[PDB]
Every structure is written in structure tokens, then in C-alpha cells.
Write a protein that binds this ligand. Structure first.
Ligand code: AV0
Ligand code: AV0
Ligand code: A1L42
Ligand code: Y01
Ligand code: Y01
Ligand code: ZN
Ligand code: ZN
Ligand code: ZN
Ligand code: ZN
Ligand code: ZN
Ligand code: ZN
Lengths: 327, 321
């Protein structure tokens, strides 16, 4: 046919999409209510380790909100001001969740630093122990529910690992609470625990921001490489040297490509165009590929704007920057 | 030429860029010194209007740093993983500045609400008056030094000069009558609301640019009409035009041509018309035979005339289900 060959038609209200959104807000509601209970307990206990656990629960709630808004907004069609669509809402929500986690972790880190230096605080061991045990039981209940509700095919399995990690962190906080309750004169255990767990949370959120910032710079997607795309385009019969090969990603799974193709004077543009588009779709699954077909016009051999970028890496290409810094 | 007519290949380093480099360093150093003075004064006096002034200076310094890093990055060429270049550093720096402003002003609102509720804080009137007077004097000195980016700097300095006259008025009122201690939280509240109202439009523009949205200056209808005006075109579909920054615009579209039209002629005419009329920094358009099956095909139909709010209002049916 035409550029619609083997195209996946995206509907609005997919029943699988409805199931996903249903389980998503169920998990979100459970996380929010248990976060509320746990933060009330932490405010009662005047501690900060369970405050770090509540911050982690807040991060989980924010991530679920970001996923839910993205899921809803993906159903809406592309408009005259959002011609690509509302896909990048997922990336923006991920960045917002990371920023919120950074803010809360920084606030808690500053509070822990103040508590460590001033060392003027009292901790209610009776309340802290009860609320930490409640959190541990909550994580165990969530894990048991997820295992029982498993074998949505991959969502439950993906959530199970995170529940296990939260359970391990809850065991850490519970051990800190035991140490504080049995020996109240070790009251500095709570700031140390919250400091270490905030550092761990920042380390865990470090890699999920690199991908978001790489996407939000119109950068090449991690999965798809420039070299395979260029080789695939050049391997199409009748194709000479190409230029202006722009390919980027709207999200982790939505990849868009664009290129200029220079063909021989004896090659039919339609056939080579269709072959290149089909090859790109089959090999890489680009969700949108609008490539331009031109005659060779040998004058581009001397054109500086038609030269492909060098194989230098991002870290390497920025090492000549200090020349501008020095000046 | 072929497709790069009027290439405009900007040099990596230009003397104007070095001049902007020197100007930005001077401004950033002055603003950082003024930040140091303001924060020391506020910490000494245990006030909060000085903290709001320091927050605005933090926003200004963040804007300076973002603009300077963007200027540095614009020099660097396109990389095999950054094929579009480092252009969107402008947008990311603006977003970072706005986010930092929002976080700092949220902390300040929290502190102001706590101070208003507890109503127990001993603030030294003399020290806070001294730092407010120093801030006003420094802002007037910068205005006098300032006597393009120069006009924008002058109007921003005037705005901040009124911003600091607010602090000076609050300071003289609290110093003349120590009883009116509660004027500081009100001043901080009003000042922060003004800052939020000022910083909302830039956040909206940055979010529109990041979401691959159509740039405000360029309209979908003029581009569609221009692409349909060239002879030999009957179906423009999958038009995708977005913007890396406020000034960098990228466009991409199909062009369905009939069997009687030369693809290169219409391609060159459309590219020239787009570059001349809208100034697109990169236009990559695809030419195809009309293939009348496109008349009944589904996703090669133009999106309907509807605003972003209008289309989103049909969304609420999703949640109920
Ligand atoms: C009624 C029961 C069913 C409920 C199931 C619904 C839950 C779905 C969310 C699971 C979740 C919530 C955490 C659950 C806490 C409590 C939940 C349950 C408690 C209440 C009963 C935790 O998922 C975990 O998050 C961790 C954070 O990375 C991470 O861990 C791992 O990564 C480490 C490196 O990162 C590494 O070391 C190691 O590989 C792991 O450690 C993994 O992402 C994952 O294990 C969110 O993370 C998921 O991550 C996916 C890609 O990120 C993404 O999935 C999709 O979402 C939409 C779906 O269609 C849809 O838009 C998309 O397909 C997609 O975007 C979403 O972001 C989010 O869904
Ligand atoms: C020793 C000499 C130093 C001279 C300083 C030169 C620095 C120039 C920066 C001035 C600045 C900070 C101002 C802080 C003042 C400094 C205080 C102390 C300094 C004195 C020691 C003004 O900041 C803007 O000013 C606008 C006008 O005030 C105003 O916007 C609103 O208010 C108006 C009503 O006021 C009203 O019309 C309207 O509602 C709005 O318009 C806002 O204040 C604010 O957005 C920076 O932002 C400006 O905006 C540009 C995009 O950000 C930016 O250009 C960039 O693009 C270039 C090409 O793409 C490229 O080259 C670079 O990417 C970069 O340049 C410029 O940098 C600058 O033009
Ligand atoms: C009451 C008072 C409270 C006040 C306290 C509030 C203050 C809170 C502040 C917290 C602030 C705490 C911030 C700590 C996070 C450090 C990680 C990081 O910023 O890095 C990201 C990097 C990508 O590189 P990377 O993530 O490091 O590399 C990862 C590799 O890929 C391995 O997987 O992008 C960038 O340059 C971003 C540049 C931005 C720099 C600024
Ligand atoms: C803690 C949780 C609740 C956060 C959820 C994630 C958000 C950061 C996401 C959810 C949906 C996203 C929004 C979806 C739609 C738009 C519209 C878009 O605005 C326009 O196109 C302007 C239209 C106009 O003003 O006419 C700007 C980005 C924005 C606000 C997105 C920015 C990021 C948002 C707010
Ligand atoms: C003093 C503070 C409060 C002011 C704000 C700090 C700025 C100097 C920061 C804010 C956001 C930063 C930008 C955010 C993201 C990026 C992407 C980053 O691109 C990458 O190479 C990452 C992705 C990849 O490796 O592919 C380059 C630096 C840059 C422009 C950052 C430069 C430094 C900026 C402007
Ligand atoms: Zn097409
Ligand atoms: Zn979790
Ligand atoms: Zn060329
Ligand atoms: Zn070309
Ligand atoms: Zn200012
Ligand atoms: Zn079609």
C-alpha cells in the first residue's frame, strides 16, 4: 500500500488499558493510605527513619500518579499544537517524580544534619517501634497479596521486586527501632539511619534521571544506535551518501527517525523510499519515520553541512569545551 | 544548492559570543557577591523579606548560569548521540531555574506560615534595616552602572529596584514601630505571590516546548496552507513541527504529489517557501505519489480544529469508565 504498511492502530479505550488503569489506581490508593498512616505514626514518634520510609512511599505514589496521567493522556489524539501527541508526558512525570524525591530527601537530610549537630531531641520508642512494625507488616501483606494475585502479566511481577526492596528497607528501619527502644541512650541511631537511607535513595534515583535528561535533549535513544541506522539506510539499493539523519525518542518505547536520502538518477524514488521505510520499521520499529528523497547532486561532497558527525562520545566531545572556558 | 540554500553555518566561536561570555561572568559575579551580602544580612537579622530578596537573587544567578552553560554548549557540534545538537539546553536551564525558584519559595512560604502561626521570633531591626539599605544601594549602583541584552537587564534591574523598595518600606515601618513585627510575613507572602505570577508564563512556555508542542509563533494552519500552495500537492499528512528552543524551530511533513509533477521541483519549492516564510532551522519533507487510497485511509487525516483544553475535556470520560 503506502506509508501505512503494517501500522498498529492505537485505540482510545482498550480493555487492557482499562485493566491497567484500574490496578494502577488501586495500588496508588493503597500506597497513599498506608503512607498517611505511617507519616502520622512518624510524627507521633518524632523520628526520621520512618520519615524516610514515608518519603519513599511518597515517591512511589508520585511515580504511580505520573504513570496514571501518562496512561490517560496517551488515549487523547494528536492535536494541532501537539502534532506528535501527548507521549512525552511519561518522561515529564518521571522527571517531576525525581525532583519531588530530591526535594523531600534534601529536607530530610538537612533535618538529620541539624539533629546530629545540635543533638537536642527526644524519641518516643514506644510509638516508633509500633509504627515500624506496622510498616513491616504492611510490606509483608503487600508482598503476599502480589504473590497471590500473580500467576497485568508483567506489572505484578515488576511491582513484586520493588515491594521486596521496600520490605528490606523496612527491616532496616525496624532494626534501628529495636536498637533505639532497647537502649534509649543510642538515640542517634535514627538520624544515622535516615542519613544512610536518603543517600541510598539518591543513589537509586541517579540512573533514572540520566535517561530522562537524555530523552529531554532530543538525544539518540539508548536501544537504537546511530551506526546501525546509517548502515541500514545506506544498504538500500540505489542509495548514496545520506545527511541530516535526526533520530530521537519521545519516551523509552517511542522512537522517531528522520533522514535525507540521496538516490541515483536511475532509481525510482517511490520504490527506494518504501524499501527504506519498511527496512527501518522491521529492524528497529520506529514509530514515525519521514525520510526525504533527493537526487545525488555531487556538489554535496564539498558541503560541510552534509558531513556526518564524528564518532566521538558525549564525554569526549565536551573535553574541548575548556578551551571556551579558558579563552 | 541541493537543500542547504542559505546555509547560515554559524561559527563555533565568535567575538560577540566572547563579549557575551565576559558580560555574563561580570553579571554573575556581581549577583553572587550581592547574594552573599543579602544572605549574611538575613541570617544575622533572622528576618525573611531579606530571604525572599536572596531567593530572587538565587533565581537570577541560576538564570545566568543556565544561559552561560547554554552559550558554552551551543559552540559544541552535533554528536552521534545528540544529532539535533545541544540546543535544548536553553529550555532545560530555564526549567531548572524555575524549579529552583519554586522550591526556595515553597520553603519560604512554609517558614512564613510557621512564623505567622507561632508568632514568636526576635528580629533585630537595626541589622535588617542595614542590610535592606545595603541591598537598595547596591541595586541603585548596578542601575547606574548599566546607565539587546542591556535593555532587558535595565528593565529587570528597575523591577528589582521596586522589589527592594518594598523591602525598604517594610523595614522602615518595622523599625519605626517595633510593634508591627507581623509585617515581615505579609511582605514575604505578597512578594512570593508576585514572583510566582511572574514565573508562571515561562514555566508554561518551557513545558510546551518540552512536550514537542507547536511553537507559539508558528501556526499549524499557515504551514498547511503553504505546503498546499505549491503546485502538484494534494495531501499533506503527518505534519510534525516542533521547537527545540524559543528561536530554533524544526518541521517535518509528507507531500503527496500527482504523477505529472517532478518530485525534486516540488520538494525544492516547498523547502524554499518554508525557510523563507517561517524560518525553520531544519525541514525534512517526504514526497510520495498520491495513491488515492489515502483518501479513505485513517491516520493520514489532519487533526481536527480543537484547542488543547477542548480535546482534554473529553478525557474525564476515561476515569469513570
Ligand atoms: C492490585 C495489585 C496490582 C498492582 C500492580 C500495579 C503496580 C505497577 C507499578 C510498579 C511500580 C510501582 C511500585 C509498587 C509499590 C506498591 C504496589 C503494590 C502495592 C499495593 C497492592 C514499581 O516497579 C518497580 O519500580 C522500580 C523503580 O525502578 C524498578 O525496580 C527495578 O528497576 C531497577 C532500576 O530502575 C533495577 O535495579 C531492577 O530492575 C529493579 O529493582 C522497576 O521499575 C520495578 O521493579 C512502578 O514502576 C514501574 O516501572 C516501569 C518502568 O519504570 C513503568 O511501568 C509501566 O507503567 C505503565 C503500566 O502500563 C505504562 O505506562 C508502561 O507500560 C510503563 O511505564 C512504570 O514506571 C511503573 O509501572
Ligand atoms: C556588567 C554588565 C552586565 C550586564 C548584564 C547582561 C546579562 C543579560 C541577562 C539579563 C537577563 C537576566 C537579568 C538580570 C540582571 C543582572 C543584574 C546585575 C547585572 C549588572 C551588574 C534578563 O532576564 C529577563 O529580563 C527580561 C527583561 O527584564 C524579563 O522578562 C520579562 O520582563 C519584562 C519587564 O521587565 C517584560 O518585557 C516581559 O514581561 C518579559 O520580557 C525578565 O527580567 C527576565 O526574563 C537574562 O535573560 C534575558 O532573556 C534571554 C533569554 O533568557 C537571554 O538571551 C539569551 O538568548 C541569546 C540568543 O538566544 C543568547 O545570547 C543567550 O542564550 C542568551 O543571552 C538574555 O540573557 C537576556 O536578554
Ligand atoms: C530547610 C532547608 C532545606 C533546604 C534544602 C534543599 C536542597 C535540596 C537539594 C538537593 C540536591 C541533591 C542532588 C544530588 C543528586 C546528584 C546526582 C546528579 O545530580 O547527577 C545528575 C546528572 C547525571 O549524571 P549522573 O546521574 O550523576 O550519572 C549517573 C550514571 O549514569 C550512573 O548510572 O545530571 C546533572 O548533571 C544534573 C545537574 C544539576 C546539578 C545541580
Ligand atoms: C505529583 C504528580 C501529581 C505529578 C504528575 C505529573 C505531572 C508533572 C504531569 C502530568 C500531566 C502533565 C501535563 C500534561 C499536559 C500539559 C499541557 C501543556 O500545555 C500546553 O500545551 C499549553 C496549552 C495552553 O495553555 O493553551 C504543558 C505541559 C503539561 C502541563 C504537562 C506537564 C507535566 C504534567 C503536569
Ligand atoms: C545554582 C543553581 C540553582 C542554578 C541551576 C544550575 C544549572 C547550572 C543547571 C540546571 C539544569 C542543568 C542542565 C540540565 C541538563 C543538562 C543535560 C546534560 O546533557 C547530557 O549530556 C546528559 C545526557 C547524556 O549524557 O546523553 C548537559 C548539561 C545540562 C544542559 C545541564 C547544565 C547545567 C544546568 C543548566
Ligand atoms: Zn505518508
Ligand atoms: Zn517502593
Ligand atoms: Zn549540503
Ligand atoms: Zn537534503
Ligand atoms: Zn532579579
Ligand atoms: Zn493513509
Amino acid at each position: 500500500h503506502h506509508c501505512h504498511r503494517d501500522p498498529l492502530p492505537p485505540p482510545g479505550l482498550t480493555p487492557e488499558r482499562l485493566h491497567a488503569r484500574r490496578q494502577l489506581y488501586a495500588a496508588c490508593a493503597v500506597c497513599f493510605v498506608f503512607m498517611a498512616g505511617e507519616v502520622v505514626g512518624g510524627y507521633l514518634a518524632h523520628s526520621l527513619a520512618i520519615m524516610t520510609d514515608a518519603a519513599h512511599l511518597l515517591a512511589d505514589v508520585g511515580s504511580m500518579m505520573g504513570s496514571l496521567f501518562s496512561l490517560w493522556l496517551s488515549t487523547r489524539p494528536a492535536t494541532r499544537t501537539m502534532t506528535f501527541g501527548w507521549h512525552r508526558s511519561e518522561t515529564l512525570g518521571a522527571l517531576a517524580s525525581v525532583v519531588s524525591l530530591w526535594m523531600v530527601t534534601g529536607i530530610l537530610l538537612y533535618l538529620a544534619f541539624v539533629r546530629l549537630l545540635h543533638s537536642d531531641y527526644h524519641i518516643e520508642g514506644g510509638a516508633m517501634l509500633l509504627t515500624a512494625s506496622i510498616a513491616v507488616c504492611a510490606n509483608l501483606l503487600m508482598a503476599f497479596v502480589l504473590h497471590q494475585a500473580g500467576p497485568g502479566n508483567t506489572s505484578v511481577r515488576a511491582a513484586f521486586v520493588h515491594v521486596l526492596g521496600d520490605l528490606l528497607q523496612s527491616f532496616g528501619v525496624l532494626a534501628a527501632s529495636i536498637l533505639i527502644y532497647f537502649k534509649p541512650q543510642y538515640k542517634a541511631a535514627d538520624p544515622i539511619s535516615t542519613f544512610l537511607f536518603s543517600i541510598c535513595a539518591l543513589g537509586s534515583t541517579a540512573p533514572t534521571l540520566r535517561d530522562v535528561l537524555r530523552i529531554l535533549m532530543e538525544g539518540t535513544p539508548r536501544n537504537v544506535g546511530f551506526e546501525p541506522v546509517r548502515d541500514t539506510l545506506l544498504s538500500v539499493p540505489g542509495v548514496r551518501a545520506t545527511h541530516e539523519l535526526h533520530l530521537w525518542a519521545l519516551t523509552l518505547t517511542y522512537h522517531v527517525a528522520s533522514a535525507h536520502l540521496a538516490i541515483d538518477s536511475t532509481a525510482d524514488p517511490e520504490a527506494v523510499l518504501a524499501e527504506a521505510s519498511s527496512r527501518l520499521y522491521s529492524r528497529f520499529g520506529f514509530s514515525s519515520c519521514t525520510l526525504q528523497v533527493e537526487q545525488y547532486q555531487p556538489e554535496m561532497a564539498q558541503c560541510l553541512r552534509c558531513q556526518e558527525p564524528p564518532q566521538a562520545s558525549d564525554l569526549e566531545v565536551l573535553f574541548q569545551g575548556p578551551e571556551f572556558w579558558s579563552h
